[PDB]
Design a protein that fits this description.
Enzyme class (chains B, D): oxidoreductase
Order of helices and strands of chain A: HHHHEEEEHEHEHEHHEHEHEHEHEEH
Number of helices of chain A: 14
Subunit structure (chains B, D): Homotetramer.
Strand content of chain A: 5-15%
Largest sheet of chain A: 8 strands, parallel
CATH superfamily of chain A: Aldolase class I
Bound molecules: protoporphyrin IX containing FE, a molecule of 2 linked components (SO3-FMN)
Protein name (chains B, D): L-lactate dehydrogenase (cytochrome)
Number of domains of chain A: 1
Shape of chain A: globular
Oligomer: homotetramer
Family (chains B, D): In the N-terminal section; belongs to the cytochrome b5 family. In the C-terminal section; belongs to the FMN-dependent alpha-hydroxy acid dehydrogenase family.
Catalytic activity (chains B, D): (S)-lactate + 2 Fe(III)-[cytochrome c] = 2 Fe(II)-[cytochrome c] + pyruvate + 2 H(+)
Chain lengths: 386, 481, 386, 481
């Protein structure tokens, strides 16, 4: 109801200067105060109780580092290559449907500008349901070396997909991410709630359709949305290039595991089934700090993705916001490796980690209301009255 | 003919004379065995209690429980005016109207309810204090009632991708019939507290009127008679199940089984987990400023259930089993099923959550080959479609809900019970696709991550001095705000 | 400061009628509002951070029951015998120094009246630093069969102790509890704090002094204050009768284990070293409900003790308070056995218990301030405005 | 002679000219290597900065760090009035006086402080915002800083009874000397933020004036010179230890070791866990509206420590080891000790708590026989006497505290540092009796319950809808109140 004015006093001239944004949560606190209710509902939502959405972040907290001291770390190099090309930093913007709800004027173009306008050029997955055409987004994209991938929601009308694959290969996208964790649109009750005052995606998809989609294209194929060791090993038996261990930001099945627990489980199997070199394994979901990024790289992930932080940077400070988020994260990784005693993404191995309490995901017995309610704790000292 | 004078006189505990609907009853022998505590009858002895009485009981109870020669006689004209008891609402102020504006249509239109918690919220705001305490309470500290639900959250899923999940089919077979859904309505006592006009006649209706029909379990302590509730059923194809408390006068029980069998209920669920009434302190508290009885016999034994099979042709399900050895025993006397339950945490506190006993029991049932010969149901704390799926993956034939159907029926009558069925039917169908399975038959434990099932912790007390002085990081302030 | 008047409007005629006290916590909420600050400080205190004081209660919550259904439980008998005599119920009032701070007019006499004035007669441990003489307390004691024990703080001046042992044996006390967990008076900073506006106990005590104290008396001897399996087995090698597994209500060493964890550990060793029949093992600390009592009895304890609940019942409703607390607890035990499917304290064995998470005493990693601070949960439905 | 005009001119990042105490300095080469960030120097370039400068630095720093020919010359008379910088208190309003009434004597009399948390509380109320942020902050999310202390609580005790604990003796030997206590004061940088007049000269004093004297570790970044701090020591028998950051200009480091060795410090603690400055976001935040440098060389290697042994006769302790393999390496190059530390959680977040690495390390040190040849110290989050005892039982020779001595010295100067020593000396003595041991030598791991050491959990998110609607039990209301 006419909040738009209050909200406008918020973003107009009260957002702080980008030089004061310390971490990816600041982009998120500011976007929750100014985005429109339906932008906010749609970007932040999770499926149902959002325990997977949050467990995704929190599972990073079950893993602690075992650093090395007295290692020369004057120079640290954080570039890696993902899926053939060499990339500046080991993370990427992952794909967000409808980026124009938050940044109406420039949509997923400003993200494209942000991933290539600064020193660091980060990859950008363009969403099949992006609110700006592939055409435009790739054209906004400031800088040759900055790479871009299409993620695909195969349609029931396979005609539309085949044309679309062909048209983006024409446009030079550098790989195909087929999202398979969404045969139906998980329930996101925050949306639902405010929406009170699908043909588009084919629920029939199958590994055979991935096999045929292989033959219809030359780009590399990454299945986005694996959540089991068994389908990582399958995506390897039908020969795709990649697999993103992901549960769609916890917007699809609640009580799906966090990707980092599934990565730590799958990688030893890959190594024992000898498949490890044959598969790029990416991981996204709830990654908010450089040490999160680094924990996933140490276990074997090739690149970790981020959806919501970029998206809220982009919605509050447009393409410049996305540049600042790209470097905030770039400095976190870089400072932490220096502190970890490694100098290059390939040095990042598992023995930099204490994985002994990775499975200490607990649900504690219900608090004792009454005992807690009569108990009074000690008190600090006081200060003279006056 | 009995004079008011003579009547009123006997207002004392070892001589309870009371009047209900212009009739005097000698309730002396009766009150220590009144299911809803003897306090009510004791206190209101020597009065005309009909307003307490008439709106909370099944129409058949005076005839069914009191010896014929205790129905004393007609009261002459009427009581003294301050001897007719007004409707029982302990602790309720004149609130009755503020909670009636609260419910009168400020209750949101029934197509805006997104989940089963919405009905809890709505009922906690509009229901009568006696009925909220009665419906929402657990035994003592309620740690088993909360634990019943949180134990679900110690289980994660292990989904399949790129499976054609175009058509998914959630229907199944429970106890001989084929049901549309894998959940049912468990027996709750006294539904008229929250739905004074229809009570159970409305859950008979929401369960059967729609394109999905859910099994209904009727309670031995239901505020409507089993005839009234079956007669309310709108569909000829919906299943009703009768739940039994066996009385110390076993002929009373024996007539009751014969009766519900003729009305055509389809199974007999014999509750065995309340030999004594658990202590529900929110209720208790509500009378102080507002445990045995012969009614539930505290002597049932495995031999009784052995004798009941012989008296009946309905399948018998033992409802209230809390450990594997009793699951295995129930199997050995050839009963058809067992409902793993702790009665919604209203009886022993620190009884375990049924999802955890089921994860324990079903592998022992498989290894003993008794697995295919006993259907195992589970209830307690099931609020979402993925709780139901966690139980079906571990082996339970069917999942019971007692409390969400009581708040739904309480705020919205039968269309609440039908809406509540759609919420949950959609949530299950919806996560069967995202799990990559298309039929209940495909739910297997290899779809669950069971490795932290047992990670039920009690953490050490924390340090109020360390945390009293710690300040966390802060977010950026706006230039304004 | 003149709170005494407000406080007096509290206890005078605003305490609820004893018939409305539902559980042992109600006695505690009411005593915290009316006791004098120094009574309250001294009764509720723990050593230092009070984590042992609370862990004592909470460790009961790590243990869940495995009940039996379809057991005739029309009749349940909860009496047991402790230390030779046969006792009504399996719990006892444990010893509280200075009971007159809360009940100034009748001190530990009203407790003595309370343990024998009703149907149930419960034991009463009389404290060496009780604020009423043994003489009086035993004389207040209404009823022959009601039993009473002295607990002893041996003095440095052993003369005073020897006379005192002899004088209480004269007075018919039924056993000696020597408290050994207190060679110094643990720091109870709530006291300390309000006290801003020892020869009495011998820190030299040793198992030899217990050996000699055996020869100077005929009463049975219980060492109160064992906290290790090793000294349970020692108290058995020098032949005393009992041992109370206790850490003095967590007023002595913080980070002492809860008695119930130590009981569950010690009892199998006793059984394997064959000593089990030779030792009564009691257990007190943080027992507040009948199911607590029952969990300790199932593992082998002979009787569980309670300090603070009796003490606050006694300070708010004097001897009648203590009667009501004795029956509140008596009905809890009795209802729960009925629900457990057992009919007699000897039926209470370990297999009535799920001890699988007894050691799930966890300290979780620090909450993530910022993530939690930007996250907003789902919302219940609302109700029309008006 | 230099004219104000010429000076002020160069107020730009690649030409920093600044005036401090009537003297112009060319600080251009210098500011990217200024330990307290280059931002301060950058911003105040072209001004007379003496009020920022004079009150926060050791008296010897311009002479020790700047090339002699950069000390430009005398400034002629004085700056423009709005070019003399006022004392740095970022984000502090005129608050300086409300916090000065706060501290002026409404600070409670020093014999009422019951524990080390009291000083935290008092300093958080009276200290300057720059100094509270600086002293109290951790890296990033601060989970290692809090975790440093809570890890203690995952260890319980296993006490002895009926042991004669009449006389208990807490004294011990650390690094060759015999100390009265098993704790010491770890090096904190900039003590003048919280104690502007004496800084470190007062912890030299509280540590030595009393009947108990505690070892003091002096920082390479101390706001007083190592001479001033040793000269302040009141007792001839107290131990001072020097902590080193080695600089990229190794001659600067080499002169510094030679110097502190002549002043008679007793050990060299070489911090190795901050090659780069951890990101302490409370500080950061305080300048926005208020990481390498050559100063700490990011190239030290095990060979450097190998070369330092040859240059020195002090024992060398490596301070900042976070894993067993580096404990074992430090042992293999024959250094005397290792301080298991993560620098008070100010450097890498998700580094482990030192009490847990020590429980891991000491059994591997015993089995390799290196156990007796390396003294292992531990710091981080030690606030009570039973934390110290948990570390001594597991093997640590001595426990370090950096932050409680900084709040104590900040609110109460040297008598705070002496009081803080008594609080902790009493708490240790006191629990050695209740453990039943009378000497540090008797503390062994068979006195600890170590079975839940590793029970460091992160629980699943909980269900805000289930808990939003649950109401717990309530206590009895008074008839009144
Ligand atoms: C005439 C014989 C009676 C029979 C056979 C009878 C039977 C029952 C039964 C089967 C219940 C269900 C218990 C539950 O689950 O809560 C009940 C509850 C109750 N009855 Fe009766 N009743 C009788 C007389 C009375 C009388 C005379 C009163 C009037 C004071 C009364 C008041 C109640 C109340 C208040 C409850 C609900 C328990 C509560 O307070 O939550 N009943 N009765
Ligand atoms: C003349 C050469 C200088 C030397 C050798 C020097 C040295 C140092 C050292 C060793 C520290 C300790 C760092 C810490 O742990 O926080 C420090 C801090 C600091 N210095 Fe200097 N400094 C110099 C010039 C300046 C100047 C000209 C300013 C004036 C703006 C200044 C302001 C500060 C401040 C503000 C800090 C504290 C860091 C904070 O803000 O928390 N320094 N300096
Ligand atoms: C957030 C989001 C949105 C807004 C949208 C979207 C998304 C999300 N997604 C997801 C992804 O990309 C990822 O995975 C992320 O997010 C991760 O996590 P974080 O935590 O970081 O956030 C998606 N996906 C796909 O594939 N596609 C698209 O488009 C998307 N979107 S939806 O579908 O959901 O709408
Ligand atoms: C809640 C409830 C009520 C109200 C009542 C009742 C009950 C309950 N129950 C129980 C059952 O049904 C179940 O189990 C349920 O509840 C579970 O939980 P949830 O959580 O889901 O809810 C019962 N039972 C029988 O059988 N009967 C009857 O009636 C009942 N009720 S009482 O007895 O308690 O009254
Ligand atoms: C509480 C208390 C008080 C007040 C006092 C006292 C006590 C206590 N104690 C202790 C005992 O008795 C026990 O152990 C109890 O308490 C248990 O716990 P609960 O939780 O229940 O509370 C004691 N002890 C002895 O022995 N003695 C005496 O006297 C005592 N007291 S003091 O010493 O501590 O004062
Ligand atoms: C807190 C602190 C400050 C203020 C400063 C500083 C520090 C700290 N550090 C560290 C040490 O000393 C230790 O480790 C402690 O702190 C532990 O924790 P607590 O929790 O106990 O407190 C340091 N270190 C060295 O070495 N140096 C120096 O100077 C220092 N400081 S900084 O660097 O960071 O500035």
């Amino acid at each position: 109801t006419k909040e738009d004015i209050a909200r406008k006093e918020q973003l107009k001239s009260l957002l702080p200067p980008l030089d004061n944004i310390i971490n990816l949560y600041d982009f998120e606190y500011l976007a929750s105060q100014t985005l429109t209710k339906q932008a906010w509902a749609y970007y932040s939502s999770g499926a149902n109780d959002e325990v997977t959405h949050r467990e995704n972040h929190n599972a990073y907290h079950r893993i602690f580092f075992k650093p090395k001291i007295l290692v020369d770390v004057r120079k640290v190099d954080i570039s890696t290559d993902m899926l053939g090309s060499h990339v500046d930093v080991p993370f990427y913007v992952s794909a967000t449907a409808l980026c124009k709800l938050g940044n109406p004027l420039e949509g997923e173009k400003d993200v494209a500008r942000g991933c290539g306008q600064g020193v660091t050029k980060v990859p950008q997955m363009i969403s099949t349901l992006a609110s700006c055409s592939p055409e435009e987004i790739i054209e906004a994209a400031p800088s040759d070396k900055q790479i871009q991938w299409y993620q695909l929601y195969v349609n029931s009308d396979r005609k539309i997909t085949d044309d679309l694959v062909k048209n983006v290969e024409k446009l030079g996208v550098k790989a195909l991410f087929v999202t398979v964790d969404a045969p139906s649109l998980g329930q996101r009750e925050k949306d639902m709630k405010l929406k009170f005052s699908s043909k588009f995606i084919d629920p029939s998809l199958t590994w055979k359709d991935i096999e045929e989609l292989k033959k219809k294209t030359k780009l590399p194929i990454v299945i986005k949305g694996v959540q089991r060791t068994e389908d990582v090993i399958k995506a390897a038996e039908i020969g795709v290039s990649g697999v993103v261990l992901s549960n769609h930001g916890g917007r699809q099945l609640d009580f799906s595991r966090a990707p980092i627990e599934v990565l730590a489980e799958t990688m030893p199997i890959l190594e024992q089934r000898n498949l490890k070199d044959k598969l790029e394994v990416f991981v996204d979901g709830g990654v908010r700090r450089g040490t999160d990024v680094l924990k996933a790289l140490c276990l074997g992930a090739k690149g970790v993705g981020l959806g919501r932080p970029f998206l809220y940077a982009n919605s509050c400070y447009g393409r410049n916001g996305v540049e600042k988020a790209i470097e905030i994260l770039r400095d976190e990784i870089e400072m932490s490796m220096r502190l970890l005693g490694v100098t290059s993404i390939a040095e990042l191995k598992p023995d930099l980690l204490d994985l002994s309490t990775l499975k200490a995901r607990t649900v504690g017995v219900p608090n004792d209301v009454l005992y807690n309610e009569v108990y009074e704790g000690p008190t600090l000292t006081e200060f003279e009255d006056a």
